[PDB]
């Protein structure tokens, strides 16, 4: 009953810098449908087991979704660093929830390159957990002011992946869903079977 299909089977995904978040409530979730479903190359839960999830009830589940390089999936984890964790999507050190990813080369690559998926390459400080930065201000990497115009040491902060289907698997696009589980005073509406 929980519309996980809306998230996992969306036609297109957000760029990692502008990651999407769906709030899930008032429904029944069969997480076993997700885990014992093939072709997830990553399904790692922290603080909970996938099969214990069917026994728990939560007030709210949050599903964050975005696309990254295959090489970057390991950054969607507590305690990791790199351009994605630092500038785009940061999981806290003490994350409770699940990280699910799968190869999306067929959906998100094309010959000549799919340039619609972006990531933040430059930022003055690290994001911290669950912060979302969608600004596109010119990044001033040197000491000369940029006047909002790209130039030497004056960078557009977002760079394209340019996914091509003949890329190596580490340079192929992966779709990622991050589940966060909230238990508040309000009665729990997201339960397993």
């Amino acid at each position: 009953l929980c519309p996980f299909g809306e998230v996992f089977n969306a036609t297109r995904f957000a760029s990692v810098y502008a990651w999407n978040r769906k709030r899930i409530s008032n429904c029944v979730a069969d997480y076993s449908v997700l885990y014992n479903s093939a072709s997830f190359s990553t399904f790692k839960c922290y603080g909970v087991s996938p099969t214990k999830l069917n026994d728990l009830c939560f007030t709210n589940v949050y599903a964050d979704s975005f696309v990254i390089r295959g090489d970057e999936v390991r950054q969607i984890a507590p305690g990791q660093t790199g351009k994605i964790a630092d500038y785009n999507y940061k999981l806290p050190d003490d994350f409770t929830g699940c990280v699910i990813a799968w190869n999306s080369n067929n959906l998100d690559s094309k010959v000549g390159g799919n340039y619609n998926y972006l990531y933040r390459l430059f930022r003055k400080s690290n994001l911290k957990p669950f912060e979302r930065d969608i600004s596109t201000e010119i990044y001033q990497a040197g000491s000369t002011p940029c006047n909002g115009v790209e130039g030497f040491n004056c960078y557009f902060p977002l760079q394209s992946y340019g996914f091509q289907p003949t890329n190596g698997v580490g340079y192929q696009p992966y779709r990622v869903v991050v589940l966060s589980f909230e238990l508040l005073h309000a009665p729990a509406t997201v339960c397993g079977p």
Partner: single-chain antibody
Amino acid sequence: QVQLVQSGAEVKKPGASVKLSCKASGYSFTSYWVNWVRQAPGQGLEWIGMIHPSDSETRLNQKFKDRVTITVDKSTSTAYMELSSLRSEDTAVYYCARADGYEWYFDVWGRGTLVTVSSSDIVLTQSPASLAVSPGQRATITCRASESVDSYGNSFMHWYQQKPGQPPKLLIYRASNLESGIPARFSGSGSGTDFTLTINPVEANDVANYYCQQSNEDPWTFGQGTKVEIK
């Protein structure tokens, strides 16, 4: 040349099976989706499904889930589509068509296979049904969609042209982009749910049918078509 060579026409009894084939050449078979799109008399263009030959990943129109199986043979660069329990409303032209991931407009079209059987989704609405224009005038066709076909800074609305005994031909992709090889008198605009195709100035060779098609959400859907004549 880049082409999709389709199997010949078949005549089937009701309840029988039909397995079409679509052989590709000139490009990297495993780098593109192969779609099946039928032109049914009275119903029009409907997308059946698609398969990516790199790993045979499929995506079916739920209207067809229980009757169609799609398959590929990479060594022969051939896509197959088998539609079962054939009914008289299955009689149609069956095109195979190429599409990029993330885009899913159709830039290369097979000839088509006529199959004859003896004895929710985004709905696209074009107007006018027929338009008469003299050469040198600016012709305008309209396409309206059930919901928005915009997504992530793009409008996934595309325009095609069809002439007799000839598959559709891509003219515009993502609302306003002239497909390479198409003359500059073809023009596209719009956003959200309302889109316009413009031919200016019309030529005697622009007499054809024109269809819009959205690829914002599953399944892909076509409009019912607009005819442009000359007067």
